[PDB]
């Protein structure tokens, strides 16, 4: 279709809770090659987060059953592998949009940070289901995307900006859960919470319901990791 009709069908699919449809509309929009607006890139990001989330949730259930377990073991194993394939195909679709269209046309610091943070997240999803030989390479690609986003946001954004906070939350999850560094995870999260608290007289109407909900999630992670 035409750009504007594609966006409208995506919003409709959103209301119907039909996330595969929503993601195929926003993939087509991205493939036209023009820089996405704020409204468009949030739609793309919501569609893929729901599509990939359903696979990750199913993978954790099946892979655990296969653990606490024979022909019954082999079955769980095969079913975990079919779910893994669906998951990788989804991640590589997103990763390929980021590299061919989104990161090259990103004209502001804020949107470069957004896409680099997305690239860290989707390599991290691959890391969760990787084994042995490929894992080191994949973990490295996640860490470098995160690290470049972290440096740009420190130089260009206020400590209360939602995109800057959201990045610190996910990069600290990476340390804790992928790299096994609880001490670096805690100190990353604590610095982000404290610098935001120091500057609270400076949050607007727009981002001041998003900023404080992420601050809440940072403190909740700390209490969990500290207990």
């Amino acid at each position: 279709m035409d750009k504007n009709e594609l966006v409208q069908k995506a919003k409709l699919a959103e209301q119907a809770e039909r996330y595969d449809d929503m993601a195929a509309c926003m993939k087509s929009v991205t493939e036209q090659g023009a820089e996405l607006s704020n409204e468009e890139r949030n739609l793309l990001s919501v569609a893929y987060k729901n599509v990939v989330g359903a696979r990750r949730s199913s993978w954790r259930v099946v892979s655990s059953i296969e653990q606490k377990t024979e022909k019954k073991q082999q079955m769980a194993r095969e079913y975990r592998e079919k779910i893994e394939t669906e998951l990788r195909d989804i991640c590589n679709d997103v990763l390929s949009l980021l590299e061919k269209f989104l990161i090259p046309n990103a004209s502001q610091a804020e949107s470069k940070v957004f896409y680099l943070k997305m690239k860290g997240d989707y390599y991290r999803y691959l890391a969760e289901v990787a084994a042995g030989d490929d894992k080191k390479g994949i973990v490295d690609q996640s860490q470098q995307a995160y690290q470049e986003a972290f440096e740009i946001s420190k130089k260009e954004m206020q400590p209360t900006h939602p995109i800057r906070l959201g990045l610190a939350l996910n990069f600290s999850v990476f340390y804790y859960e992928i790299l096994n560094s609880p001490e670096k995870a805690c100190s990353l999260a604590k610095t982000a919470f404290d610098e935001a608290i120091a500057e609270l007289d400076t949050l607007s109407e727009e981002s001041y319901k998003d900023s404080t909900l992420i601050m809440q999630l940072l403190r909740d992670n700390l209490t969990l990791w500290t207990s």
Partner: peptide, 6 residues
Amino acid sequence: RSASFS
């Protein structure tokens, strides 16, 4: 578990 978010 741990909270992440977008």
